[PDB]
């Protein structure tokens, strides 16, 4: 199966690294294609002959339970468009250890590994990581910050669409994420660009390879393609209070004569502040609980109510032509990534992610739990004490204050709310451009509504 080859390839990747140090301390010659093959062949020959013990991270009961789950419940993914393919990776949030995965529907009839090898746009699941998480991490927004969802166009003059909608008006970050509106995301990444935020640095620190960052639809998955295993690692990062642990299936390689030629060490990396990550956790909780973009929490409740009450957070994604659906799920302890789609890129049905993948993955979650009862955990996500609380106007997402609205000072007041920030001073006082994004025409409309106090 996938298991043998996934496991063997990373083990022989580790041997490669080991040897290029042992059998040579090799130069920048390591960028030579002939040295690359040579050490690959040597790494392969090493494992075949050296009588090595290769300890993987794979939990036997859980992985086997996952293989049974796709065998028994994979059919729930099929919607008339074919035998819908699938990839899932289950990851320990505190270590980056991969405990089990689904490579696809049936190895014998399709050998493509959809957990580890196949690469596809993360679509809207890019958003928490590339746009909102970074903007929060930079003190550029908090939990109740307002963004524009007013009609706007890409630089090439085509409208930013969401299904058949050209947009609406102002909305909170919560609303923007629960619905996965696109315009707010566009404006957020555009602000990071304009302010010279090293988004590349953040993404690369989590192991993401993206060839061109100068792309407007980047936060929506444009110009990105990723493996499920890698994309799961990004969500692990948010789940584990902002601390990245590199994904892996090999924990140790011992030679026949006892010695350790490779062993996992924990190298945590604080990619987002704990304030940021914890604030995002609370946003992603409501993404699932709101049920706007996924029936997951309902599906799971009907199967296992007690497990439905574990503290589930996550995000959905769907590519433009419904060719890819994603659902990423975390409890404090584990993250489970899910992708469905077709190898030839045919469109899925419009409810394929909303319903089918959601229902399928609720079944997968339950199978995992029957295989290892305590494993999802009863821990809850919680705000880090480093989080700054600002009482802000609901209408502006900023503190109450005076503003000039076409001449005339307005004392802006109304119903307030506690907004959570990841900077030092929290929310600013309200200014005329209170939201992320918006044209002068948008703001005339928005302030008119507000001024109807």
């Amino acid at each position: 199966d996938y298991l043998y080859f996934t496991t063997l390839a990373e083990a022989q990747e580790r041997m490669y690294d080991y040897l290029a140090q042992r059998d040579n301390v090799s130069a920048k010659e390591l960028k030579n294609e002939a040295t690359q093959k040579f050490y690959r062949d040597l790494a392969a020959k090493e494992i075949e002959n050296g009588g090595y013990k290769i300890t993987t991270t794979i939990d036997q009961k859980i992985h086997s339970a996952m293989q049974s789950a796709v065998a028994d419940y994979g059919y729930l993914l099929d919607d008339g468009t074919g035998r819908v393919e699938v990839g899932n990776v289950l990851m320990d949030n505190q270590t980056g250890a991969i405990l089990g995965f689904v490579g696809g529907r049936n190895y014998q009839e399709n050998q493509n590994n959809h957990a580890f090898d196949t690469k596809r746009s993360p679509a809207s699941t890019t958003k928490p990581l590339l746009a909102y998480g970074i903007a929060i991490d930079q003190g550029l927004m908090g939990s109740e910050t307002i963004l524009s969802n007013y009609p706007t166009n890409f630089a090439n003059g085509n409208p930013i669409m969401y299904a058949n909608s050209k947009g609406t008006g102002m909305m909170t970050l919560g609303e923007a994420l629960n619905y996965s509106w696109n315009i707010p995301a566009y404006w957020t990444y555009r602000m990071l660009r304009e302010n010279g935020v090293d988004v590349k640095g953040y993404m690369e620190k989590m192991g993401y390879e993206i060839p061109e960052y100068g792309i407007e639809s980047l936060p929506m998955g444009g110009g990105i393609e990723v493996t499920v295993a890698q994309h799961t690692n990004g969500y692990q990062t948010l789940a584990n209070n902002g601390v990245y642990h590199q994904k892996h299936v090999i924990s140790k390689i011992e030679a026949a004569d006892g010695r350790v030629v490779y062993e996992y060490q924990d190298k945590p990396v604080q990619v987002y502040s704990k304030a940021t990550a914890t604030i995002m956790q609370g946003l992603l909780r409501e993404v699932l609980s709101s049920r706007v973009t996924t029936t997951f929490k309902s599906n799971l409740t009907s199967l296992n109510p007690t497990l439905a009450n574990a503290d589930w957070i996550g995000k959905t994604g769907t590519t433009n032509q419904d060719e890819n659906m994603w659902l990423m799920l975390s409890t404090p302890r584990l993250t489970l990534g899910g992708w469905i789609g077709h190898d030839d890129n045919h469109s899925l049905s419009r409810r394929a992610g909303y319903s089918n993948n959601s229902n399928y993955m609720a079944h997968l979650v339950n199978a995992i739990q029957q295989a290892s009862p305590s494993i999802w955990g009863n821990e809850r996500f919680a705000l880090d004490p480093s989080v700054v609380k600002s009482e802000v106007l609901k209408s502006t997402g900023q503190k109450p204050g005076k503003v000039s609205v076409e001449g005339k000072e307005v004392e802006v007041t109304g119903s307030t709310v506690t907004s959570y920030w990841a900077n030092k001073s929290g929310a600013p006082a309200t200014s005329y451009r209170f939201a992320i994004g918006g044209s002068d025409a948008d703001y005339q409309n928005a302030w008119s509504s507000i001024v109807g106090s």
């Binding site: 496991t7 083990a11 494992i47 075949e48 050296g50 939990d59 405990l99």
Partner: peptide, 15 residues
Amino acid sequence: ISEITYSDGTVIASI
């Protein structure tokens, strides 16, 4: 013989 094991030492495959 080289062995690949689950986390609990149970052999997945011999090479």
